[PDB]
Amino acid sequence: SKQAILAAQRRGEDVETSKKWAAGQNKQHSITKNTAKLDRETEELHHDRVTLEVGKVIQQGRQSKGLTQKDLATKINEKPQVIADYESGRAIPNNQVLGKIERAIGLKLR
């Protein structure tokens, strides 16, 4: 907490600093599912894909801005096939890619 840290730094020091995990680097593709859960899990056996509503939203928002799948994919720095797979209800959703699409087309996907 900022208040307690600045309170401790104006007097006798007991603060502890430590480095973050992914600090000082750019991981271009952030992982979507926690591998601690994914290595642990043995029972549940399914992945939920994107809904058809989400693909329709992407389709209508992209088409209403004179924008193609190639241009949207280049704009958000992804391959065209992942856009065509998001629009066709085939790809497992990635929140980071979804957020890039939302800032690209100005709609809300979650």
Partner RNA sequence: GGUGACCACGGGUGACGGGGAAUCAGGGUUCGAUUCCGGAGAGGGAGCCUGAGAAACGGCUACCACAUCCAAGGAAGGCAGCAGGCGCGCAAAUUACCCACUCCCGACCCGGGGAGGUAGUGACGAAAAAUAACAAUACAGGACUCUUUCGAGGCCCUGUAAUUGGAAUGAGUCCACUUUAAAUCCUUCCGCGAGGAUCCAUUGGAGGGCAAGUCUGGUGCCAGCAGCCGCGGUAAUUCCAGCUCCAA
Q: What does the alpha-carbon distance between residue 73 and residue 57 come to, in Å, rounded to a whole number?
A: 16
Closest contact distance (angstroms) between CB of 85 and RNA is: 13
Structure tokens that stand for 93 in this block: 């959703």
CB of 62 to RNA, least distance (A): 16
Angular region, 73: left φ>0, alpha ψ -120 to 50, beta rest:
alpha
The answer to whether residue 12 forms part of the interface with another protein (CB under 8 A) is no
Question: Could you give the 3-state DSSP secondary structure of residue 78?
Answer: coil
- Return the DSSP state at 15: -
Count of residues near RNA by CB under 7 A: 21
Give least dist CB 80 to RNA, A: 6
16 makes contact with another protein (CB under 8 A): yes
Residues across the chain: 110
**Residue among 30 and 60 whose Cβ is closer to RNA:** 30
Binding site for another protein (CB under 8 A): 6, 9-11, 16-20, 23-24
